[PDB]
Ligand binder design. Structure first.
Ligand SMILES: [Zn+2]
Ligand SMILES: [Zn+2]
Ligand SMILES: [Zn+2]
Lengths: 62, 184, 176, 80, 105
């Protein structure tokens, strides 16, 4: 969406069309606190799957 | 259906402190979910509770016909074939048993006794059935005889150690240790 | 008599009951050396004479039952740790005997004692720890992530070609 | 099945301090363990458990072999 | 083939005095006019023709396992494209989720 808004601003003759872009961000939701909860036993793989943090992958889905 | 859940924005997740030693915990979690060989026990338990009963009650319906090869001997000339038809209705598998001395009452059999005595860690298989015999006559009529059988033990099925039908499944780790089993 | 004795002396249940009988002194701490000692140990552990065992049809009803009946309701977590080990041992034997006898209301007690013994095994796992260390990065305060791995970087094209476009051939060694 | 009576390499009498070094070690770990299940201690990635001064307080010298065999030997009582 | 108008069967093709005659097993016979003058054919390099990769090339911008390139899409002005390399001549095609496709397709 930010790419379209930046392009839209450029076609409008604006000089600062580049300031409408945002950086790309990709990350996993696994946190250092989740690692500590695993070692305390209060976080299992079942509720890591239930919270949408990890999922099971089969060689054909891979 | 469309997915309705939403997660917090990925731009606010704080993972800059994550070390590759912290990720090992994830592996730990995985190994704690499946155990190490948990699939073997689960598969054998599925075969015990659901597999063999389904196979016996569904895929082993017998319906055969045979020539009547008798002699004159009254109406036997007028009957040509007999139709044997039966199926099994009840199926179950129990825990391994052994008979103490002779004419005993089938006490339990622990795995260590089976290992030492060269025995078979096999639990009894009990079946029940209903049978229908049809006799076909030359003129065109037929006669049907139906019987129902009380449950009886056909044989013994091998039991995987540590599974549901194992005696070392109702025992604690100390009790497992003290009956000669590897507690770990 | 001989076949019954040979069958039962190889039963793990027999050695477990004999251990429980030895713990509280009901039978001598050594193995039988004479026929009389073996017959006495069998009578005490199995609870029936070998000749009388054939006579009937029960077997598990009278197997030894430990003398001291501690209170296993302190196994509800509530000179305690050695007492805890003693209670775990005695409760395990008592539940083993209950399972053999198909005593009513056993599965719930079995799961309860399974939870108790899982806690006890957690304590033993604490006892079985050699220690562990992590080499920390002084700049950070956690496990070292510094590595000598390869790190890609687009070099200038002048590192391969000259201002006339020809490739470099590093073949003259200069010694000072 | 136990910490050896003597060092496997040089033969210094490690065993005479083994039992003590057992108990003390556990106590020391109980101080540093921290909100983590026992069986997860070798996975914590934040632990700094060092037994150097504990072994030194026993009088055991600074020999690599002796401290190696004292620290690393498995105990059969703790796995059975 | 030729399909019999009576029994919808596959007729057999024969050649008589310079004409194609389709004769069925039910006795019905017809003669093809123009569309039946194709005795045989073959097409080469079937594993790299444009007709093979139509679905893949259409789906390429949406497959997350495809290589991306930092190059502006000239249509929607998105700053990245999906690059694919098909064939033994290594033909490079840049595609976008908006429908843009280098090589004009
Ligand atoms: Zn040494
Ligand atoms: Zn036709
Ligand atoms: Zn586009």
């Amino acid at each position: 969406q930010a790419c379209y808004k930046a392009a839209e601003a450029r076609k409008k003759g604006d000089k600062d069309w580049e300031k409408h872009k945002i950086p790309f961000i990709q990350n996993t939701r696994f946190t250092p606190q989740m690692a500590k909860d695993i070692l305390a036993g209060t976080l299992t793989l079942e509720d890591l799957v239930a919270q949408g943090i990890c999922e099971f992958i089969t060689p054909e889905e891979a | 259906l469309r997915p309705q859940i939403t997660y917090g924005p990925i731009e606010t997740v704080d993972n800059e402190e994550l070390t590759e030693a912290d990720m090992l915990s994830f592996i730990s979690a995985a190994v704690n979910s499946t155990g190490l060989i948990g699939y073997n026990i689960k598969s054998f338990d599925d075969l015990m509770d659901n597999g063999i009963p389904q196979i016996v009650k569904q895929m082993f319906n017998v319906d055969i016909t045979y020539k009547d090869q008798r002699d004159h001997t009254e109406i036997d000339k007028l009957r040509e074939s007999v139709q044997i038809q039966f199926n099994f209705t009840d199926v179950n598998i129990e825990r391994p048993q052994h008979r103490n001395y002779s004419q005993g009452n089938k006490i339990n059999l622990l795995p260590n006794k089976a290992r030492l005595c060269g025995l078979s860690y096999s639990g009894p298989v009990n079946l029940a059935a209903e049978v229908i015999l049809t006799a076909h006559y030359s003129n065109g009529r037929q006669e049907v005889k139906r019987a129902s059988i009380p449950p009886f033990q056909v044989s013994t099925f091998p039991i995987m150690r540590g599974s549901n039908r194992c005696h070392t499944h109702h025992l604690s780790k100390t009790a497992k240790k003290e009956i000669g089993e590897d507690p770990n | 008599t001989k076949v019954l004795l040979t069958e039962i002396l190889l039963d793990p249940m027999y050695d477990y009951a004999a251990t429980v009988a030895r713990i509280d002194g009901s039978i001598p701490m050594h193995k039988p050396r004479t026929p009389k000692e073996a017959e006495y140990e069998f009578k005490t552990v199995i609870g029936r004479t070998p000749a009388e065992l054939l006579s009937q049809k029960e077997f598990y009803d009278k197997i030894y039952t430990s003398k001291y009946r501690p209170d296993f309701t302190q196994l509800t977590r509530l000179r305690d740790e050695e007492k805890t080990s003693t209670l775990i041992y005695l409760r395990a034997y008592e539940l083993f005997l209950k399972y053999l006898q198909n005593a009513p209301n056993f599965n719930s007690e079995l799961a309860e004692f399974k939870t108790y013994e899982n806690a006890y095994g957690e304590q033993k796992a604490l006892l079985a720890q050699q220690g562990f260390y992590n080499i920390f990065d002084p700049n950070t305060g956690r496990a070292d992530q510094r590595t000598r791995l390869f790190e890609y970087k687009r070099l200038p094209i002048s590192t391969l070609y000259d201002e006339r476009g020809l490739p470099h051939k590093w073949t003259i060694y200069v010694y000072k | 099945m136990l910490i050896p009576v003597v060092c496997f390499t040089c033969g210094f009498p490690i065993g005479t301090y083994a039992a003590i070094f057992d108990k003390a070690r556990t106590e020391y770990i109980k101080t540093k363990m921290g909100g983590t299940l026992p069986q997860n201690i070798p996975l914590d990635a934040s632990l700094q458990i060092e037994l150097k001064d504990l072994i030194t307080a026993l009088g055991i010298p600074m020999r690599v072999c002796c401290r190696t065999h004292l620290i690393t030997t498995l105990d059969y009582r703790k796995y059975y | 083939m030729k399909i019999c108008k009576a029994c919808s069967s596959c007729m057999v093709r024969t050649y008589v005095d310079g004409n194609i005659i389709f004769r069925c097993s039910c006795g019905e016979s017809v003669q093809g006019d123009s569309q039946n003058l194709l005795v045989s054919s073959k097409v080469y390099h079937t594993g790299e023709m444009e007709d093979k990769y139509k679905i893949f090339i259409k789906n390429a911008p949406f497959d997350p396992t495809n290589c991306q390139i930092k190059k502006d899409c000239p249509n929607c002005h998105l700053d990245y494209l999906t690059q694919i390399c098909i064939g033994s001549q290594k033909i490079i095609i840049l595609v976008c989720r908006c429908g843009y496709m280098s090589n004009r397709g």
